[PDB]
Amino acid sequence: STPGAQEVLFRTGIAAVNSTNHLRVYFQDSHGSIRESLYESGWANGTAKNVIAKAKLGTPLAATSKELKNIRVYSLTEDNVLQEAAYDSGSGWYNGALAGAKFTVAPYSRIGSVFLAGTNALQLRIYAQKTDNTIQEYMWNGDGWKEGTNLGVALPGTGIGVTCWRYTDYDGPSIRVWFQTDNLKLVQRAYDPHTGWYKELTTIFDKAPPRCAIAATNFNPGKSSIYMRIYFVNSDNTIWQVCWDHGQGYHDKRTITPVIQGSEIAIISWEGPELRLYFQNGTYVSAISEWTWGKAHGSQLGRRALPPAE
Amino acid sequence: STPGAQEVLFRTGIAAVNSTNHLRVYFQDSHGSIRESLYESGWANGTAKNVIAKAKLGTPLAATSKELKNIRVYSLTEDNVLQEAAYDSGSGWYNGALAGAKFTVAPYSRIGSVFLAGTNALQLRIYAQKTDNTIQEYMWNGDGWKEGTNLGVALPGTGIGVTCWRYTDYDGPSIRVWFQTDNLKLVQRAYDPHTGWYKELTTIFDKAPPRCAIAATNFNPGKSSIYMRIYFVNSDNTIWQVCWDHGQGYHDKRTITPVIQGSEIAIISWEGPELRLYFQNGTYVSAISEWTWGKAHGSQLGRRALPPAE
Ligand SMILES: C[Se][C@@H]1O[C@@H](C)[C@@H](O)[C@@H](O)[C@@H]1O
Ligand SMILES: C[Se][C@@H]1O[C@@H](C)[C@@H](O)[C@@H](O)[C@@H]1O
Ligand SMILES: C[Se][C@@H]1O[C@@H](C)[C@@H](O)[C@@H](O)[C@@H]1O
Ligand SMILES: C[Se][C@@H]1O[C@@H](C)[C@@H](O)[C@@H](O)[C@@H]1O
Ligand SMILES: C[Se][C@@H]1O[C@@H](C)[C@@H](O)[C@@H](O)[C@@H]1O
Ligand SMILES: C[Se][C@@H]1O[C@@H](C)[C@@H](O)[C@@H](O)[C@@H]1O
Ligand SMILES: C[Se][C@@H]1O[C@@H](C)[C@@H](O)[C@@H](O)[C@@H]1O
Ligand SMILES: C[Se][C@@H]1O[C@@H](C)[C@@H](O)[C@@H](O)[C@@H]1O
Ligand SMILES: C[Se][C@@H]1O[C@@H](C)[C@@H](O)[C@@H](O)[C@@H]1O
Ligand SMILES: C[Se][C@@H]1O[C@@H](C)[C@@H](O)[C@@H](O)[C@@H]1O
């Protein structure tokens, strides 16, 4: 390993945001502080001078953004209250109002977060697991945090994946949420602007490891078309990918890359499509590694050890 | 899962002590508290009313005992100081003097602990990883905790296995310590009463997962003979066993049982030989399971879900 890599918590939560190939990655260090590494034509930071929040050890991490003008990063306090680190262009980093609402979740809860697409207004939906193991939606729509729709019972400590886009034909955001149920299946809940939340759980994988990491993204949204990618750590100790492609539905499942036992994962994407995965695969023991996909070279490992590791 | 199982921290540290088939198992709950489950012709306890200490989330755990008269359980504070929960017959549980010595270790350090065998006096040796990644020995011999021998550089966050016995022919304890080096090998350091600490690192396994759990025991010590068992989580997501048997040396390596990704492990034994392993394999998601070995039936899974899970 390296002195920098040692600062990164083993099996740390991971989250990432971007505006095309301008990237931010968030993770937890060994003392509980949440750090930010960035990519601006080169990787940097991720040091003790790059802390945006403090959370309990082994906290989940979630993040969403509107380009890089507005960024929100979610974690858990030591009392298992959802808290929010907020960045706004022109104001910098500050404590968000979420913790003020005093939403307590399960100790083993994960978090998902999305800005609602299709509008310039700042609307947020975040998802967590309450003490009754149900996946609760919490919302921001301009004046205060409120509980939203409850998405039903999930496995204790389930991973939570979430993505959001807007069909050109429709006037409102579409939302997809992925988690693991008691039968260890991976399933999808769905919201569309013209239907509201569908009742149907859609299975995307029959049997995954318990509390496996889950993360999802979407690209190339159209009039009534979408392409989605969902990633989870399978029992063979690699990240697996599930593909939704317009005109084919869920039509592919394949391994992507090795990871350490019990690695967390983050996924970002931009039009192209370009994909970036972040995870731990044992590089310098505890460093975060990058996996890439692009039209030019296809599936390629990226940055081997993110800052502060190198 | 079950409400009881949910209280058990995922990938919790695990430690166990015994006097023959009278057993104690220690683990961490989701709020950081260290609990004790027991076996006295039946499993019990492990509830919030059975807390013996409080430690940082994801703390290592180590424990050693002289039968069940004296028990010591070691963990890390949130400042990564070694602390000790102590039980003495007739006095019950109390804070041990270890934390008073203010030994700070690496955030990712593990702990090993042994009472020195062969004497009725209460002598302790405990092993941890300092911030320079060297494995430091700390000792108790009657009046105060002191740093002992340093065993050299190990992998950052290495597991630490340790066992202790007394050869009948010799007048002093023998000690064996196992950890993982930078080349991801598993190795042995050795102390004998007539030689002191040998200089030689002995390899017992060529390549294990980074920071894999490690735990060891011994049985049937003789005049100049010993039998040892070392357990670690391999890359196939099972516990593997390494056997030392008198007249054969290190002569066997085999899988034992499946475990969750990144499970910790504990091992106890008594004359027979009887062996008990404790670990997490996904039973009720987060419960601790038992694996057994005896002369009667050989390799058999034991208690599927320890208290408080059931
Ligand atoms: C053409 Se460099 C490629 O794309 C960048 C946006 C980053 O993901 C970098 O780590 C990767 O190696
Ligand atoms: C314009 Se400052 C730069 O860009 C923002 C998107 C944030 O990630 C901030 O922490 C970083 O220092
Ligand atoms: C302008 Se309030 C600021 O932005 C909102 C979108 C929310 O994230 C809120 O919690 C935060 O405090
Ligand atoms: C206008 Se309904 C409101 O916004 C939607 C996008 C969903 O988050 C729904 O659950 C919530 O109740
Ligand atoms: C047409 Se390749 C297909 O779509 C890409 C965008 C990637 O998700 C790749 O892993 C998948 O196999
Ligand atoms: C003859 Se029961 C057998 O031995 C006991 C000492 C315990 O380890 C128990 O869980 C196991 O099932
Ligand atoms: C004689 Se009390 C019983 O036995 C001791 C060995 C301890 O494990 C204690 O916590 C338990 O309640
Ligand atoms: C009679 Se002091 C008691 O017992 C010793 C063996 C040590 O574990 C010490 O730290 C503890 O406070
Ligand atoms: C009488 Se030397 C003392 O006790 C031995 C058993 C070892 O722990 C050694 O490292 C220590 O320095
Ligand atoms: C003579 Se079986 C041999 O020794 C036993 C005590 C156990 O460790 C078993 O796993 C091993 O295969």
Curated annotation (Swiss-Prot), chains A, B:
Beta-L-fucose 2 binds at R72, E84, W145. It comes from the Eukaryota. Beta-L-fucose 1 binds at R24, E36, W93. Residues 1-310 are annotated as: 6 X approximate tandem repeats. Sequence repeats lie at residues 1-52, 53-102, 103-150, 151-208, 209-255, 256-310. One of its GO terms (molecular function) is fucose binding. Beta-L-fucose 6 binds at W43, R276, E290. Beta-L-fucose 3 binds at R125, E137, W197. InterPro entries: Fungal_lectin. GO terms for cellular component: early endosome. Pfam families: Fungal_lectin. Lectins have particular value as specific probes for investigating the distribution, structure and biological function of carbohydrate chains on the cell surface of animal, plant, and microorganism because of their specificity for defined carbohydrate structures. FleA is suitable for detecting core fucose on cell surface glycoproteins and/or a useful vehicle for delivery of substances to the inside of cells. Beta-L-fucose 5 binds at R229, Q241. Beta-L-fucose 4 binds at R176, Q188. SUPFAM superfamilies: Fucose-specific lectin. Keywords: Lectin, Repeat. AOL adopts the six-bladed beta-propeller fold and contains 6 binding sites per monomer, each located between two adjacent blades. The 6 binding sites that are non-equivalent, and owing to minor differences in amino-acid composition they exhibit a marked difference in specific ligand recognition. Belongs to the fungal fucose-specific lectin family. Lectin that specifically binds to L-fucose and weakly reacts with mannose and N-acetyl-neuraminic acid. Has strongest preference for the alpha-1,6-fucosylated chain (core fucose) on glycoproteins among alpha-1,2-, alpha-1,3-, alpha-1,4-, and alpha-1,6-fucosylated chains. Binds to fucose residues of IgE in mice and human, causing antigen-independent IgE-mediated mast cell activation and anaphylactoid reactions in mice and is possibly implicated in allergic response to Aspergillus oryzae in humans. Homodimer. This is Fucose-specific lectin. The lineage of its organism: Eukaryota, Fungi, Dikarya, Ascomycota, Pezizomycotina.
